[PDB]
Structure 1
Amino acid sequence: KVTVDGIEFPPTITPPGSSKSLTLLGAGVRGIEIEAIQIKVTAIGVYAEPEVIASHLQKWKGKSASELVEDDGFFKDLVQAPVEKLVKITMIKPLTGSQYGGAVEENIRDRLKALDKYSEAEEEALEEFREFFKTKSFPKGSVIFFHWSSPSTLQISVSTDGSLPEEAEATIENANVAAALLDVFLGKNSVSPSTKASVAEGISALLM
């Protein structure tokens, strides 16, 4: 397990609507700082299938956690790897659905605009993202499951109490939004350098 801010991230999770078990790569915290005030917003865990994802990362074999974490190409390879992925979010700071969703939407939208990959299709995908989160509430301990069921298919499920949903609650089909959301966590300018640091540890260990 990796414990973050008192929150357990277990070694394995089965995505909602899925039967396949995914394994923990790493976990960390998303914190914000302004005028020296630090606030922990969420904890983040990243899951995939160990040997399947090791199969796409053999060029990083033998490398240490220190080596991997400072190589941007490493995280790029991980975002791009066409394998099943899951990101679990556990809420630390209480947020409304609109609050949480609006910020991740903005992050994705800004990333796509920077790449000149924000067009009508992506706009509609992010409107669906918005529609989904608008009806939700995120008290402390609530959870979000972002599941990459295909490289271009994002499933979202939530629970207010930390239970594991039985099914994907929303499905968004758009390759650019799906990759951009991964980059929110694993890209340059990640919301969580700690999560990246932990994933580097996990994959370094995994590539023996």
Structure 2
Amino acid sequence: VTVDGIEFPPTITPPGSSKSLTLLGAGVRGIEIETIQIKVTAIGVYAEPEVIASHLQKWKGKSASELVEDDGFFKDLVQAPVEKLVKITMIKGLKGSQYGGAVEENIRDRLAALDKYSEAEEEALEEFREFFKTKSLPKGSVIFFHWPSPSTLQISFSTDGSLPEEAEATVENANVAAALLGVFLGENSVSPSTKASVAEGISALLM
């Protein structure tokens, strides 16, 4: 499986973890320059297939096109209490503070909309901001977002693109954790391509 020349492995064990997760789908974050789509990142989404399948039973029989159009499906996915991992490979290089500010803005907008942005969420976003502050994210580098639990976010990163040995940082906050996942799979998604791919992955899995 490859996305814009970036191959996503069928499985990944999250940094520091023992549980092997399976690729559900992958896509890109696209931004436009005067109507032209530019690919900035490739995004791969991983979870435990047997396990996540058992929380999404209600969606069996539905095709990819049907899941894609159903917002409750992605909500289930986001909310499902199983281990998840998102692997992001940079296609255009960015400053960590740029990548980090963009994600933070997305999350904050989501928390605001849900009316779930209080002091705790602010402090968690600070930790998230702190992670990317002095980092550079060149072409080919990789960020790992790992949700061992829906309220626990573990982050790591390698300039190399190689798999970190361990998680570098942990952010403990249910709302921010879930909103970040939503950046990818949610109403607040930056990547319709990833969502369509994950839908196509899960559809096939449920049959």
Q: TM-score band (shorter)?
A: over 0.9
Q: d(CA) in 2 for partners of 1:169 and 1:135?
A: 14
What SS does the corresponding residue of 1:163 show, helix, strand or coil?
A: coil
Q: d(CA) in 2 for partners of 1:189 and 1:76?
A: 11
Q: How far apart are residue 180 of structure 1 and its match?
A: 0.2
The two structures, once aligned, show a CA RMSD in angstroms of 0.8
Q: Deviations over 1:153-183 (max 9, x none)?
A: 0000000011110110000000000010011
What SS does the corresponding residue of 1:16 show, helix, strand or coil?
A: coil
Contact 2:155 2:170 (C-alpha < 8 Å) held by counterparts: yes
Q: How far apart are residue 132 of structure 1 and its match?
A: 0.7
Q: How far apart are residue 37 of structure 1 and its match?
A: 3.1
Q: Deviations over 1:71-108 (max 9, x none)?
A: 11110100000110000000001001101111101110
What SS does the corresponding residue of 2:75 show, helix, strand or coil?
A: helix
Q: d(CA) in 2 for partners of 1:189 and 1:149?
A: 21
Q: d(CA) in 2 for partners of 1:14 and 1:149?
A: 11
Q: How far apart are residue 64 of structure 1 and its match?
A: 1.0
Q: d(CA) in 1 for partners of 2:9 and 2:53?
A: 20
Q: d(CA) in 1 for partners of 2:162 and 2:28?
A: 20
Q: How far apart are residue 38 of structure 1 and its match?
A: 2.2
Bigger shift: residues 163-172 or 185-194: 185-194
Contact 2:110 2:188 (C-alpha < 8 Å) held by counterparts: no
Q: Which stretches of structure 1, 4 residues or longer, exceed 2 Å deviation after superposition?
A: none
Q: How far apart are residue 150 of structure 1 and its match?
A: 1.1
Q: How does 1:15-164 map to 2 (within 5 A)?
A: 15-164=14-163
In structure 1, the gaps of 5 or more residues are none
Q: How far apart are residue 34 of structure 1 and its match?
A: 4.1
Q: d(CA) in 2 for partners of 1:37 and 1:69?
A: 24
Q: Deviations over 1:101-159 (max 9, x none)?
A: 11101110111011110010000000000111012111100000000011110000000
Q: How far apart are residue 36 of structure 1 and its match?
A: 1.3
Q: d(CA) in 2 for partners of 1:105 and 1:88?
A: 17
Q: Deviations over 1:185-206 (max 9, x none)?
A: 1112410000001001100010
Q: d(CA) in 1 for partners of 2:25 and 2:120?
A: 32
Q: d(CA) in 2 for partners of 1:55 and 1:176?
A: 24
The number of aligned residues is 207
Q: TM-score, normalised by structure 2?
A: 0.98
Q: Deviations over 1:47-79 (max 9, x none)?
A: 000010000000011211111111111101000
Identity %: 95
